[PDB]
Design a protein around this ligand. Structure first.
Ligand SMILES: Nc1ncnc2c1ncn2[C@@H]1O[C@H](COS(=O)(=O)NC(=O)C[C@H](N)c2cccc(Br)c2)[C@@H](O)[C@H]1O
Ligand SMILES: Nc1ncnc2c1ncn2[C@@H]1O[C@H](COS(=O)(=O)NC(=O)C[C@H](N)c2cccc(Br)c2)[C@@H](O)[C@H]1O
Ligand SMILES: [Ca+2]
Ligand SMILES: [Ca+2]
Lengths: 464, 453
């Protein structure tokens, strides 16, 4: 009686668990005492969680809030939700009760699921509650009864919604389409062990989980506690055998400050990937210098396409490089640089708004058709087809070879990188005009404050 | 300097020519003296046409009107247009000059291409003109010079635009992405309807996506396409001789292709012991005519194909063998795996009651991008899913009514907005019931033509 996505249909369950068919006994997870979990045991876990979820009688398109960080149990849950066409809303357990309530009021999910050891209480009675562990999914309060209307699950069904409220809706066809494009460009192999640092509510964790499991590689989730302490973090990457380290630039700040020598001892790290914001070039030159046998990739993209471009940094980085390239869109992705009037910008070095044609496009903003119509727009180069493109809110310019350079947001123009030129300045935040700098008004500080997702907390700086 | 779609990107060129890599010397076409064309020779033809097209400096999304029927040359052209991200507008050569001008005014194509022997003259000077043959693509009048802005071709780029007249007299251009078409080709290749050993008799004009279905299904599989010329079709003897001499194993056509053959040559039709399959779509197959065709070819599986241009297709259901004599109407069955139908009432609420008619709302991976230059029409048809109105997920509001049986099978129950005609003012009920068949170019009942009596 529960709809299950068929093998022939774009769905996270089939995409991420292909390796259970082809290599059941290869490790899918490495966690902490270093233990592996097989693709086979991972799949059995997804299936058990799916059986328990199926019994609740949720229709396809019914929403499950998933409060957890990147764990084998949290990934088995989102894959079980995926199989049953139940869109997952990932929420980090470090989210204030206030912001979870706001998500629960807009999303109106049928079910809220957290870990057995998780400590969320005071979820309202309108929403069902459950708890997951390797033992199984245990229901505290059953969702209200309903009639199931959807017969079959399809590729355009919603896989996940990312809330910041702003809810980016993403189809299984869209996510899998990005996973395929980056598997094509050959960024990692089944032999790799991917250190992922992002919280689960940030699609960079969904990228890392999908990239890894889709390839047949092992995921190495780094808990936030291990991450906070430079020596704890490096010992974690060491003990788990990480070959690839994925994170926002900020994961490196403490280790470059307090433990440069020890970071130079990650003899097994073949790669580093970052996205989310500019990597300060001084910090980036230092990390490259200490790990010379590690490929470093600049990943550019937004939640509404999951991602867009992946560009290897020059090795070494030119010491008077003004800006890093965000390179070329993935095969099957295409960027126009349009001026204020939607006209192409064919002049090298002139900034225009990135308009993205992608096979990984979001379905829309949850319950916000007016916002959707401002962002997901008629292709200005083919306005009559009804083709839509992402109006990105990102400015960029091209070099002589057609490479892109991120030039900040349209909405932020009303200094950072000309302070990075000054000796001893390793990271600089300017906002509206104060400036805050890591060594009108200018305040030197120790570290920059971070959002939960690990970006420059500009709002927090604004208030001091 | 021209953009070419990459191998990894949903595109008709790579989808339809994969067999040139894996089986270059298997036949892709059988035509009439019975001659084959290999996947290898087909590809060489597409590649030559692509080199010639590339020289015209067309940008990705620039439109090429293709006036032709299903020929090896016409298919090589649409695959070369495909590779270069140039959307093809297929037009039947028996289209009045008046209707071609209407398409040319809306579509504002950069190029109009026809066969060497084709006889369209005085195409306007605003549009480039060319002619194709085995010899090559020859440009009479070159398209305007322009600046190429598109760097890369993507799966969501427009493969083809199908132009008919809407329910008003306004041009109706169904825009279809490469990702959308290839997605349907894959779903029907999955269901295993034909094999590389099959020879597909295709009857549709090129301007009807049933020809695009047949071309794609066949070439995508590695099978052989058997295009039936329109003249040979109209004369029943010539038609059956053609199916016989070409070794056709599958016959694709609207029901009307059978009317003449069942009238004048039933016993000759019974001679095609090589036909394993028949496929039809476009309208109801009259049961008497269908029982007659079944009777004459008892070793032929017959499939009921249901769908519209805006998803290319939807469902494929075997007609029962034999047809139980007490059948009210044929089942249009179950949507293809990865396709899904809701039956909604007038208020967008689900219809869970067996035998009650609702409007088909279709969730499909083969959805059209929109109606050419008609965003208001697009918003009436490509609508917010009434079962998930907040996601921004969209469904096809089909304009078809249907109902379900005991087992959840579908039955077509006609149009929401609606041979027995209802000519309006109470609508008077004529038939050809108060008082008591001409064909559209695509081979359907010309209801409009009967209405004028
Ligand atoms: N590489 C850069 N240099 C500079 N500015 C960047 C870069 N990457 C982004 N950004 C900025 O961050 C915005 C986007 O924010 S987001 O929607 O929260 N998503 C993200 O941050 C992460 C994004 N989904 C993602 C996830 C996985 C892999 C990749 Br590859 C990308 C972009 O619009 C840019 O303004
Ligand atoms: N099998 C039926 N029983 C009864 N009524 C049918 C059937 N198939 C359609 N129709 C009608 O024709 C309409 C649609 O018209 S259309 O856009 O010109 N497309 C078509 O005719 C053909 C359609 N693209 C197609 C092409 C190839 C294969 C298949 Br499988 C389907 C549908 O809305 C239906 O009303
Ligand atoms: Ca254009
Ligand atoms: Ca629903």
């Amino acid at each position: 009686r529960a709809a299950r996505a068929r093998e022939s249909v774009d769905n996270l369950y089939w995409f991420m668990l292909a390796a259970a068919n082809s290599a059941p006994d290869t490790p899918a997870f490495v966690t902490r005492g270093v233990r592996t979990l097989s693709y086979r045991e991972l799949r059995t876990r997804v299936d058990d969680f799916a059986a328990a979820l199926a019994e609740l009688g949720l229709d396809v398109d019914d929403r499950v809030v998933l409060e957890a960080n990147v764990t084998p149990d949290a990934v088995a849950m989102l894959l079980a939700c995926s199989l049953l066409g139940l869109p997952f809303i990932p929420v980090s357990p470090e989210t204030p009760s206030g912001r979870l309530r706001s998500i629960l009021d807009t999303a109106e999910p049928a079910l809220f699921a957290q870990a057995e050891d998780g400590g969320r209480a005071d979820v309202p009675a309108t929403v069902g509650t459950a708890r997951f562990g390797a033992g199984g999914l245990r229901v505290e309060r059953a969702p209200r009864a309903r009639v199931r209307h959807r017969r079959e699950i399809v590729g355009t069904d919603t896989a996940y919604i990312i809330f910041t409220p702003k809810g980016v809706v993403m189809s299984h066809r869209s996510v899998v389409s990005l996973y395929r494009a980056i598997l094509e460009q050959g960024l990692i192999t089944p032999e790799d062990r991917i250190a992922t640092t992002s919280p689960l509510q940030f699609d960079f964790a969904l990228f890392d989980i999908g990239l890894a499991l889709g390839t047949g590689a092992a995921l190495v989730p780094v808990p936030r506690e291990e991450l906070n302490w430079p020596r704890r973090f490096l010992a974690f990457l060491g003990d788990t055998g990480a070959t690839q380290v994925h994170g926002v630039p900020s994961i490196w700040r403490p280790v470059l400050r307090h433990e440069p020598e020890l970071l130079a001892g990650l003899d097994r790290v073949r790669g580093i990937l970052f996205t989310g914001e500019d990597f300060p070039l001084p910090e980036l030159r230092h990390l490259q210098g200490l790990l010379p046998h590690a490929r470093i990739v600049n990943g550019y993209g937004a939640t509404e396409s999951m991602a867009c471009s992946f560009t290897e940094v020059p090795r070494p980085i030119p010491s008077d490089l003004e800006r890093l390239s965000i390179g070329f869109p993935l095969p099957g992705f295409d960027v126009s640089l349009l001026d204020e009037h939607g006209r192409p910008v064919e002049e090298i070095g002139v900034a225009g708004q990135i308009h993205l044609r992608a096979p990984s496009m979001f379905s829309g903003y949850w319950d916000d058709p007016e916002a959707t119509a401002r962002v997901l727009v008629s292709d200005p180069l083919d306005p009559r087809s009804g083709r839509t493109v992402l109006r990105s809110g990102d400015l960029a310019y091209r070099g002589e070879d057609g490479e892109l350079y991120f030039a900040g947001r349209v909405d932020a123009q009303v200094v950072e990188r000309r302070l990075l030129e000054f000796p001893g300045i390793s990271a600089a935040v300017a906002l509206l005009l104060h400036a805050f700098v890591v060594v009108a008004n200018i305040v030197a500080v120790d570290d920059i404050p971070l959002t939960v997702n690990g970006k420059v907390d500009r709002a927090d700086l604004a208030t001091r």
